[PDB]
Amino acid sequence: MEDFKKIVNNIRLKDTFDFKLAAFPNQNYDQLLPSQIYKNYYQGIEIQQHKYQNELDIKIINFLYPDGDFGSANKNGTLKLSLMLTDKKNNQVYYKLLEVSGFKSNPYGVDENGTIPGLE
């Protein structure tokens, strides 16, 4: 169908697949702060794999702040997606961290509950 090692280097959000969180079914990426996603994906992630579904399986197993703390992520509207990629031919599982931006952001990194990065 297509060699896996050629399609894995092409996995990109909004292209190959999209995700929707069980906690925010009707909200786009740009209306969600990275911190909101990080604190609510435990409710469930629905993957919409648009391409390569014959050859590959894409799962987001963890959402991580690029630098380890929400303020930094909320400022850049960025997240580090920890992925699990299954090669459907051989059935081997591969892991890959992918950094994506385009999520809601605010200049100081304050979160959805008013918390300020580093204060208190």
Report the domain count for the chain.
Answer: 1
Q: Rounded CA gap, 109 and 114, in Å?
A: 10
- The three-class DSSP label of residue 64 is strand
| PDB resolution in Å | 2.5
Structural domain span for residue 50? 2-102
In a domain, 116, yes or no: no
d(CA 14, CA 54): 18
CATH number at 59 reads 3.10.450.270
Q: How far, in Å, are 38, 64, 71, 86, 99 from residue 82 at the CA level?
A: 12, 7, 19, 13, 9
Collapsing DSSP to helix, strand or coil, 12 comes out as coil
Enter the tokens of residue 54: 């014959």
Q: How many helices (H) and strands (E) are present in the chain, helices listed first?
A: 3, 5
Experimental method: X-ray
- Residues 107 and 71: their CA atoms lie apart, in Å, by 9
Backbone angles phi, psi at 35, to 5 degrees: -60, -35
Residue 111 lies in a domain: no
